[PDB]
Design a protein around this ligand. Sequence first.
Ligand SMILES: *[C@@H]1O[C@H](CO)[C@@H](O[C@@H]2O[C@H](CO)[C@@H](O)[C@H](O)[C@H]2NC(C)=O)[C@H](O)[C@H]1NC(C)=O
Ligand SMILES: *[C@@H]1O[C@H](CO)[C@@H](O[C@@H]2O[C@H](CO)[C@@H](O)[C@H](O)[C@H]2NC(C)=O)[C@H](O)[C@H]1NC(C)=O
Ligand SMILES: *[C@@H]1O[C@H](CO)[C@@H](O)[C@H](O)[C@H]1NC(C)=O
Ligand SMILES: *[C@@H]1O[C@H](CO)[C@@H](O)[C@H](O)[C@H]1NC(C)=O
Lengths: 49, 49, 33, 49, 198, 50
Amino acid sequence: NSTTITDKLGVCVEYNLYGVSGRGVFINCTAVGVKQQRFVYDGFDNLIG
Amino acid sequence: PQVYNFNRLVFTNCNYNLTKLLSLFMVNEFSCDGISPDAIARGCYSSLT
Amino acid sequence: DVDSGPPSSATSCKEADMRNSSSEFFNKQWPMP
Amino acid sequence: PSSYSFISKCSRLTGDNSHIETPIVINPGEYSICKNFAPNGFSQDGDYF
Amino acid sequence: AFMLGSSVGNFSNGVSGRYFNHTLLLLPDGCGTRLWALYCVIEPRNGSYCPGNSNYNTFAVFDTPHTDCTSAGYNTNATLNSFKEYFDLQNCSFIYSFNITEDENAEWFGITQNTQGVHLYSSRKGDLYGSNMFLFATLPVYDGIKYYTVIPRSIRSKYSERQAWAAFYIYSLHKLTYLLDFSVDGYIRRAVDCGHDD
Amino acid sequence: VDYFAYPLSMKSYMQPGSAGVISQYNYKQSFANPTCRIFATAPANLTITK
Ligand SMILES: *[C@@H]1O[C@H](CO)[C@@H](O[C@@H]2O[C@H](CO)[C@@H](O)[C@H](O)[C@H]2NC(C)=O)[C@H](O)[C@H]1NC(C)=O
Ligand SMILES: *[C@@H]1O[C@H](CO)[C@@H](O[C@@H]2O[C@H](CO)[C@@H](O)[C@H](O)[C@H]2NC(C)=O)[C@H](O)[C@H]1NC(C)=O
Ligand SMILES: *[C@@H]1O[C@H](CO)[C@@H](O)[C@H](O)[C@H]1NC(C)=O
Ligand SMILES: *[C@@H]1O[C@H](CO)[C@@H](O)[C@H](O)[C@H]1NC(C)=O
């Protein structure tokens, strides 16, 4: 059942989001990047969005 | 087919039941490079060829 | 194999259908590098 | 299948009288130009086409 | 309109440009509202002025604007039927179809091939009012695509319906290192070709 | 020493990283100490039975 982040913002959680696996903190932000691509990375290929 | 006329399968955006497929065949040799069979059985992928 | 539909029942082709031309007809160079 | 088959030679004959013989080899993950001759497996061992 | 294959040679009379095996066809259709992806075996019909006949110069695709692109309905097999007038579609591996919206914008189309098949990119996807190409189709084409041929389109415009048509350019892709500049909204509007100059 | 009866045709199912039922439910080799796998055949005329 643990499938949403609405009321768990700010806490360290693990994630499996369409197969990408990791842990980190989720914070509501202004939409950047391309929404179609579903992920925003950085220059070192770390997920930051 | 034969070896020079191999058939290629590419899997994207789907779920597999590797064990149902693993139990149908009788393995004799394997040699992985950069991954292991258990990691193939427990992971998520952009594509599978 | 998959079905491509019904074949073409036209016996003859349209005979060059804007006739062939490989010459100074086509030199309208509008470069877009 | 009827048997196991593979290509044992693939070569181009050039020169004035096709007197020189150079091999044509595949790249990794690719098909051989020679597969078009007997694409379902060779019938006899030694089938010099 | 394109014709991508692996083996090429002369026709019967001797004109070049014949594909002998499974051939990829990218034929836009529906008066610029549909894209056809066909991976078929292509057979020269023996009829007059067709690729099998002796009196054959060149093949082409077309459509009759007042019957095909009429207001009442848009025929979606016009260019494909005009194609079949020249060739027979046998042993078709797959036939895909992609919808296209009608406009007069400037778009980009790219095509590559790797181990995972044939990849099609278009600016219409993702960035319609820009110029960045996003992958929209992957085709199970695993044979080499050694050759390609631009298929001459010809709108059957009569004297009252004659219209001007834009030219297109085809740039080869090379194995090069670049430097890109992503905007805040993720799109690329500036780059540097590292081998061009000092 | 861990020893048991095992068929030779199945000895790829006890390799490091294998994905079958042997490593899941029968025997997984540990690598905390220096270790070694051996697959052998016992001649039938000795005290060992089948
Ligand atoms: C994954 O594969 C296993 C093996 O096929 C499935 O388990 C069997 O499913 C069938 C369904 O008709 C049952 O009749 C059997 O009793 C199950 N047991 C076995 C070991 O054969 C399992 O359902 C598959 N899982 C999914 C969800 O795909
Ligand atoms: C227009 O072309 C499409 C694709 O060639 C035809 O659609 C196929 O027709 C066959 C035969 O009826 C069917 O078995 C397939 O299921 C159809 N689907 C596709 C996309 O493969 C269509 O019939 C043609 N229509 C006309 C006007 O002839
Ligand atoms: C490809 O076409 C050529 C000539 O049409 C034919 O000789 C060859 O067998 C074909 N390849 C196949 C059927 O794999
Ligand atoms: C291909 O088409 C022919 C008809 O031209 C048919 O006889 C044959 O079974 C089909 N299949 C293949 C791949 O040969």
